[PDB]
C-alpha cells in the first residue's frame, strides 16, 4: 500500500485504461489493418515508467 498523491494516481489510472484492446469495430472499420497498439502491457512485467 504505497502512497500516491493525486497526480501519481491519475497517471496510474491513465496507464491502466490505456491497457485495453483495440475495439472490434475499429478492426472492422480498418479492415483488419489496425489490430493492436503500442501501449499494451501486462502488470507483471517491466513496470510502468509513470509513477
Amino acid at each position: 500500500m504505497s502512497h500516491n498523491m493525486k497526480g501519481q494516481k491519475k497517471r496510474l489510472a491513465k496507464a491502466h485504461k490505456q491497457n485495453t484492446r483495440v475495439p472490434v469495430w475499429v478492426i472492422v472499420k480498418t479492415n483488419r489493418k489496425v489490430v493492436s497498439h503500442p501501449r499494451r502491457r501486462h502488470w507483471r512485467r517491466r513496470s510502468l515508467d509513470v509513477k
Partner: protein
C-alpha cells in the same frame, strides 16, 4: 553477498522521479535536478553540442 542477482533485490526505491517540466523520469530526488532537461537547475532547457556529432 554477491554483487549480482542477490544485491538486485534491494531495488525498492528510486533515484529519479518524473519531471514536471519535461515528463522524463530524470529528476534526481537528491540533487533536485532533472538530468534530461535541467529543471531544478536552470530556467533554460539543458542542451549540449555533444548531444549530436560535429556537423561535418
Amino acid at each position: 553477498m554477491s554483487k549480482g542477482t542477490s544485491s538486485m533485490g534491494k531495488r525498492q526505491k528510486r533515484t529519479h522521479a518524473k519531471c514536471r517540466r519535461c515528463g522524463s523520469v530524470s529528476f534526481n530526488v537528491h540533487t533536485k535536478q532533472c538530468t534530461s532537461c535541467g529543471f531544478g537547475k536552470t530556467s533554460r532547457m539543458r542542451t549540449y553540442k555533444w548531444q549530436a556529432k560535429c556537423k561535418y
